[PDB]
């Protein structure tokens, strides 16, 4: 598998591992998003000290407003972070 | 780094490696997309035998229609593929 193939597969596995803690593995609930954010994204999470931030991220990512994140909504989180990071890498090297 | 962190970083590296063949490393041109598709995504590409398919994918992904893919447009390709793959994994296991 290529690196792109491997990363597509990891995305799927990470979602599934975090979405399968309760009885619905197709949705990440608020509790599961809390755990994902404090363990896969600990570094970004620990910085922020206001606990209302995750509640605000959740609402913002929950596009159909059912209170849970489905795979696609979770991908918009991954993508939003990779875009900010890529913007900083450009900013830092074409300065 | 977590698997999510590593995958965000690989996304950025893959884009940058494929976008940096010509003099613009912030955009993947048509030629570079051709190479990326025949090497990172060879398995999906080789199946299709109609060469007009990539031209049609390119047009579809090129949302601001400047003829090149920027990082975000490239992420919509990665995401569209991970979503179809996750849909097939659900279809196959909740059958």
């Amino acid at each position: 598998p290529t690196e792109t193939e491997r990363c597509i597969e990891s995305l799927i596995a990470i979602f599934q591992k975090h979405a399968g803690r309760d009885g619905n593995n197709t949705k990440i609930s608020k509790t599961e998003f809390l755990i994902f954010m404090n363990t896969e994204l600990a570094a970004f999470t620990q910085n922020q000290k206001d606990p209302g931030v995750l509640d605000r991220m959740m609402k913002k990512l929950d596009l159909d407003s059912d209170g849970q994140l489905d795979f696609q909504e979770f991908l918009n989180l991954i993508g939003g972070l990779a875009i900010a990071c890529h913007d900083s890498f450009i900013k830092s090297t074409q300065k | 780094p977590t698997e999510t962190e590593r995958c965000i970083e690989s996304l950025i590296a893959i884009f940058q490696k494929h976008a940096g063949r010509d003099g613009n490393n912030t955009k993947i041109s048509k030629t570079e997309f051709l190479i990326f598709m025949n090497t990172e995504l060879a398995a999906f590409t080789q199946n299709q035998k109609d060469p007009g398919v990539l031209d049609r994918m390119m047009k579809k992904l090129d949302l601001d229609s400047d003829g090149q893919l920027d990082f975000q447009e490239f992420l919509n390709l990665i995401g569209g593929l991970a979503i179809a793959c996750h849909d097939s994994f659900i279809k196959s296991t909740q059958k």
């Binding site: 970004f44 910085n47 931030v53 972070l81 990071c85 900083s88 | 780094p1 962190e5 590593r6």
Partner: peptide
């Protein structure tokens, strides 16, 4: 890697 540090700085 670079991402983890970025995440720390951004937000």
């Amino acid at each position: 890697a670079m991402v983890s540090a970025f995440l720390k700085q951004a937000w």
